[model samples]
Target: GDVVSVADYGAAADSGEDSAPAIIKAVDKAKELAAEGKNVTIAFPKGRYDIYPDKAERRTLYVSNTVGTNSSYKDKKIGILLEDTKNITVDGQGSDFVFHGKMTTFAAINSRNVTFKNFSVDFQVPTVIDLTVEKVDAGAKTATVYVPEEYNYRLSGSNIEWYSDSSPYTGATYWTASNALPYVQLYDTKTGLTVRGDVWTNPIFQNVTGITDAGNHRLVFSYSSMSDKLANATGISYQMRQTTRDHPGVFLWKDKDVTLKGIDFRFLHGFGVVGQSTDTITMDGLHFGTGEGTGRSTAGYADFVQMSGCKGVITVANSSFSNPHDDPINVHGTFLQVVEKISDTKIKVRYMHNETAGFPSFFVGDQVEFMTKGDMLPVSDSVRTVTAVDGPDGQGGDMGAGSGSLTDIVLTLDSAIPSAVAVNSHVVENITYTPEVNIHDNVFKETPTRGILVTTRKKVTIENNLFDGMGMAGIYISNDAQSWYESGPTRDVTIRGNTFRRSGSDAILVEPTNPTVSTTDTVHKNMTIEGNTFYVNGNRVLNAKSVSDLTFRDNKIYRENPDDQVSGSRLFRLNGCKQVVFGGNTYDVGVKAGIDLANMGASEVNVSDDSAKVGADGLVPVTGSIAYVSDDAAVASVDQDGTITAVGLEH
Candidate 1:
């Protein structure tokens, strides 16, 4: 015979004020009941509890499945801390009972089959949190990376602001706390991360500020979210250490049947979301903002989102994006991105790659604001107020700052921006909408972070989404082309893609690992990357970071760039990657890295999207062939002719 109630332990476990003694005592009883072979119920009254390690290990709740072989779920060490236990279930009582940064005393137990359902994780602290770390090399070889250097740094993607030792002085005087600071932000030589495996689902790699060491076989799927007000573009010279670097909004990790819907992956260090060694993971209906769009996680790291090491089927669908500052998704192909509508079509010029392909043009439209993944409201339907003074160059014409334009303005809560109305010259008939006005530079507006960001995942699908006015590569993949997370694993992946016709930055950049994070432990294996378009202001076709068996077949790769790389950007530059198979594709204007298998000596790469897009009729097989911009815009034409020689050379 057995009983089913909490143990009357006389007194409640103490942890200072507002701590619930009943909740504490119930947890103790649950543990004792399990030892006596009884299935008992321990209920928590609706109230908040503090887990102070100094007093009693700080666990508000402790659970165990005397028979089930698992423990309580993520709730452990969350709202309630559970230690040395397994196999349990929890019931959510009320919202007021939980708060983050409060349960900071004890580390929970190692569970086996725990489960937690329908409980909100909210009011988290405004700080960073780290999960794991490993070791590797130093120099990395990324295809298109926008790291904050000393001098020239733009907050386009992957960062809210860049801080370097040699940054400028114009914008920081009255803003950042350290207006006179000096530092450089780079991920090289001896810096990065490493992690474990999660079969089919994508790892949640969200809200990370920097990387201090080397890593390998890492995969970041999607789930970890980023949500923050992105309004600061400080100079590129500030730096934050590792202790305070990881703090993404939400991370739904280690599950085969998981769903992250209607969540905005706003501001963080890494991608909005990254899943490692996961499968059967689904990322749906998400919105992301990047770079200056998301204030700073810190000044240390620049990888917004990087996915490269999972081995299973992933579905990333119906998502929206603006600027994904870091590596969005780094895996063995098999990926996807879903879109809504296309706007703010501008692809700024890149310094590397094929300059002929780099172009920059700004598109101003309604406020490029995104909703919470599950909510249709704007910025949680909250009003944001900011005061601004009349600048040197006053508002243009009749809608000027003093006249119709607001002076010493207090911005109200509205959907679109006044300038954004200029995007569509004409207004709707019965729509009486009052758009908000932004006094910031109308030339280069901020962008969203990422539609789907992951690392080392397999069989991933990114479909039916929108990536408008993005800050960096819409979808960036960084992976080792031959190695899987687990031993004797298959890194077979596929990315048939989505429809990003008008991408602000490079539509998609597949880069190799920084030689620092690239090694024999990681391999790309087999992949299918196809069915996508590079309509306007786009960048390169592929960038391998030490991969193997990667195919980009049948797709339209071109340059509808706004700012012709008078600044210079190559279409492809095989930095430190190898063993590629190329063929069957049509590119409009850009330089090609051809088939230079060994970046300095890495191996096995492939370039074919499998008859997924256009120009598939009589496609040519990609052999280690190199193609440079011709008919007018070649590197020789620009470097030699300097100021305007060939027709296409200028753009």
Candidate 2:
């Protein structure tokens, strides 16, 4: 079925004209009939196709774009920028990809097994002017509106709202100071986000903002309006969202086995579905945010779904991440720069997977981790193996080493390194095949922040997801070397049967990346937070730190609103950590404590007469070997005469 048709290279479907060069000429002739093997798709015919209608005409595709220091679309705007194409498919049967003049609603770089189906993307709604408020200091919170395309609104993060005079800020009538308020900042920096000695706070527009990073997607203005007369006549209008331009609904870099089905994204600026340094990604029924009450107020639309520095396998099922201001799914990994040191502990990296393409399936002894760029940690604690790999040899797949020509490497670590790591360091290859993350049955509504974030992944499986209202941490399992992002470490994770209804923070969070008294070695190991079902109306169902074989079984928590009680304070806040296990858990009915063990450091559990304290309490006493161990049990628990009970407390 070499089904090609962007109207067979004359694409003019309703939105008419600029059908992205006749749909990129039927996707470059269906990539030359899918390189002669055929089975291509292309399609796309139903309604509005319209993409880049000469909106300052730009198109680069791969690299090279200077145009006055730079423009939007990451680099030159247009549509359909699939690189290194392969076994393709891009059927938008019931089509509607109206990008209007920007870049990305569709992009798949360094591609492979690609598929993008049933589209419905929307954007290009910029240009608005209705500014007039001359001035309204509000104590340096500054407000002197007169936005005539406010410098063409080159987008910075200016969202100002204080409407009235026609009644439009309603949702059960919120926004007060006589009812009407809004103020967004950034772009060219106007400060005003309030909350520093309080500058008249009310329904003063808050979906939470400090605008930490204003990636400033220089928009050409999106919305602007103003109407002030609050001399008690009850009307002080103002509406300015602001934008210079920052577009990218689906931008994949270093892609592979990509599959995006039944799509539907609305108002995506940056990261609606982003995968950088990708490999093997599949999202079925992906319907991105900014719909449910649209507070996701477009301006460089941050993260509706993101997977950075991917190294393979990220399957997201039945997706629906609504109202994204950020994070719906963020699985990250990035940091590779060892740059030559071919001895003692070997080194010669640029970015683990393909700096020149293929050859790093990493096998021999596999296990390499060396760090130290000031305080990115781990320079020792011993771990460096991959005895050798220089090429040519075969079996089954025929011919060994030379699959993308195995880019130079040689690590062996038997200690003896000094000299700041044989000469400066930054190596990470314990990447023992990460990115096997599977997130199932997704819903994740109204997200401003996290609903799923697995950084530096490893065989992760988050099941039966629901997570209704999130702002942060419905699930955040991390690993960091942060000086400028260095990650790797977090293994075999499994959070089963999820259902957190009102989570805004830590329904499950495993933290790592402390970086201070550096002895190196970053860690978080073999995790399993089982049978989840929290309604955390009080927040925090679990917040772990520095893990080591952690496990929390039979989970269940609650906290009223028909949520009915379970102030398990923070539920289970395990710190430091070592063989933790809080088994058979269940809390409801005004709950008190399910688990909250604290002992950041210091403990051995015994002294002088140590021999399991010589038998009976049948265990250990004489004040030694056992009063501590229960950071949450199960290090090797056994009893009923076969008593062993000992793990972690020998102070």
Candidate 3:
């Protein structure tokens, strides 16, 4: 962080002189230092250095008598500008400078790695320069490499502001009705955030916009902190500049990766979060909230949050948002999922809270699903497939392959999870392994969306954890596996000794969507429903549907079925199943009949002499008393018939 002059970054600053003189001095000093491949960080020391009545910028950073094709000599105006420079960084800290005047709009910061941060710029009259041309940031790196020049790079973290009453119009931004272009512009071109590259471990603005994204931009925020008035104002105002007949925000017309980590956006006045045509972003600990009575005005039509045209994993953890409008977390796809199908991308939100007034912390589409932070594909690990077999079949195994013991492998994560992991067909990123086993118990207010969504995976063991919360699902053992192979639902996977309490949905939904296929293959096909303790809380104990040839052995189930009209909704409802054995198990369902077999029948249950009719006829509710195993729920004792035994009474 070297002290620099304003001229290096096409802006001006004074060491101790007047605004114009100091800006001139800083520029001359910085340019000399920058051209030699060195950088100068002109820092401001938390006091307003206002010597010049007008601030100059861009090509006008030069101390010339002429104002860049339109100027007067020695009039002295100072603004910031960037024209064709590399490895440069210009920022303001501690509120060191405030040039007085109506700074023009076209001179918005549009350079790469150009940062501006940490100043209480409470300027309201002078609307912060938004954006005019969506392609402003796009004209560099993108234009250099491609042939026809996509005119598209991305601009982010434009959390800058201005305030001035010098305008004759009733607004703070530039481009009033009487201008030569006659456009009502917040900037040279008003747009949304359009940026590329990995945006990790940084804070950005979300749910704050009085402008549209015709200019292009995207907001990535985690644990949104409190914002200023512009960010807090809920009254979003967007108007068509009558002269230009249009207003827009920054348009990011390319591919990019953004990570939202630990930011807090407490108040706002616009659509929740807007992102269109961007891809691969991870959201961790992201949240937003409204003021005490902000939305009481306006017709109560405010979108709490919205995300469109983005693909890949976005993780939200230990956060919350509230509003009567849109869902707190939403995924929308307009173009080809931005890059691939947005639906194909994964999103993981853990320890979240959205009970204020909206859809499930997440609202997804047919292509996309709401996932947890740990579900995304890593950037360094390769994904392979293995078949999973279940049941006591002799001919065809679990994946239709011949007999052999299926592998119950557990892929244990050494840490909580990587902030941004590779996913889908993409392999995990190249990262050094730090096999840290967290024996330290950390309490999370809630659970992850997908604690263990195992399918076509090998050697995965999930153990020693307590998951508690509503709307949280513990394990989703899916049938559909995302494999490069023709078939998946890989083998040798096991889940052991994990405690789930007070979940909104099923503790374990074993219906997978992705699986690998093989026309000719054998061995490694088996599913062991082995030793595990389950405590049901007025929820489903074992809600299995359409499974074949599996064993239910040695697992204790504590069932407290809810008193809904549908009594058989839980307490181990076995629907449309053909299984082998049920041994070494204990059921403590309090109300409904324990062990509901062939619970679900077709709408038309009767058939002509087929086995379907045999099971279909069993829907008459056979009521017979089955003897209890032993007094102790967890003991390995046998009944007089010598057929029933419970091994351990400690659940």
Candidate 4:
């Protein structure tokens, strides 16, 4: 075992100068030692170390979900680059890595058995812009906003441009020439929930017809309309971001057995930590929130952790995620469309979505499954092992005219391709790279999006988590071929022992975006939701679609005030589901009617509770007295005692 201290490589703790060169030297020494078959640790002392983009190592990287297929490879400035090293550990020793100006904090590519621990990553100027609403005047149709002193802005006519001097790149301007308007998200300052209304669709830039300089870091925006919806504007905050996700806090590509422990993500300029095609990635004791003394409201620009096309066991435990603009955790794989059947064993697959390309989709010896495009379901007996892969080149079909050109790769299967698959009608997913996920003992707080989004066919267990004020579902199970191309139909999932507090939407949602739902075929299967408590504010506790053999058991639901309940709210909304079971559940909410079958036929759904009975036409009423009256009394006689008699077959 060998230890390479960064101080020996001229890295001084608490120095104002950029320490990127010294850290790279220490990594180089560690690589040398690792090449000699010795386990190496590149150590950083317990202090702050500055990393600037100018002297940092630059490399062209093609990251999944960060770089689009239409865009070229990103020339990323990396703070710590651990590439092709074995048995190496980058130990921060309770230090803070402060980055300046558009840099990836750390990256480990094609490495094995690497660990990054005891570090906090932060940026001098974060990518997000936060503005507090100071005043709202419905009579004048205007709202005044107070901008923080950390951000600089210029008002031109009706437009507001934001910039930061800390980032020397792009002339310190936040807006690119091609993108002038940023996407906006409104959040309540007190409750930390997203502001609901038509204002969500209206960006601030589109409504502002005039801007008044109110002085003292404030600006007044006069809108043509929608001022009435901003009546509570004084209690809201607006968070805006650029559309492009060009940088990630930490990037891992083709890495295996990697562990990130005791790392604090104070601020991330882009996607927090992205792992693509990685295996056995574990993150523990991680904290994601605004650092103290930063005077900031937001912590991360996007999702905290996004794992795409990964396999083996993915575990995220004992972490705290707060105030991120997007989901805390998202785990899924990519789907590549079948472009051409080149031969009996070879087929050309192309990346369909514009935002998901330029990364390796498959490797030799990986197992893949062909899926029909109509239903987005796997073809029967169609799993094949990849024997060879060739050319992820950009010389393939275009997604559309002037949309984006696609990338194509030819995959040679170990056996002949299945006959049920054809070009333009089927897509393929890497079944070998689908991971079994375990997410437990995590705190997800005050986010505008879902707590966790998992769409994989492998076993998933989510237990003992606290979801507080999530703007969307606490756990979202989604598989789609239309928008994001994040593929996977969950085969087995267990969600137990969790506490959900006033989620903005359904506490748990299982929705797959398949174009068609077959009565005989289900998109997802084998899910058990049990032993959880839901503090209800939304209309429904669970919304499931196109799933089979689902169970909801031993869960408790409570409403703080019965008078504040949403009218006509139910506990469950189900569609195209079969063999549904509900048992040992307690509800303290005002609305006792707990189930809505959504017109799935009686034979299709089977509920365990006798109190909730499905009618012949597929409507299930949970609890209530209902008098059935015949639509045509001449054809069938009905009495108040609930008797029906047929008069004639057909008159």
Best by lDDT: 4
TM-score, one value per model: 0.39, 0.33, 0.29, 0.86
lDDT for model 2: 0.54
Over 4 Å off, model 1: 1-77, 80-109, 112-120, 128-243, 246-476, 479-490, 499-507, 513-523, 535-538, 545-549, 556-570, 573-651
Compared with the true structure, the alpha-carbon lDDT of candidate 4 equals 0.78
Clashes of 4: 0
- Any runs in candidate 3 off by more than 4 Å, and if so which? 1-255, 267-271, 289-309, 321-537, 541-568, 571-651
* Local distance difference test values of all predictions, in order: 0.30, 0.54, 0.30, 0.78
Q: Root-mean-square deviation of each candidate, in angstroms?
A: 26.6, 22.6, 22.2, 7.2
Q: Give the Å shift of residue 635 in candidate 4.
A: 37
Q: What is the lDDT of residue 222 in candidate 1?
A: 17
lDDT of 3 by residue, 106-133 (tens): 1112222233333322111222122122
Best-to-worst TM-score order = 4, 1, 2, 3
TM-score, structure 1 vs. true: 0.39
How much is 348 displaced in model 1, in angstroms?
48
The prediction achieving the highest TM-score against the true structure is 4
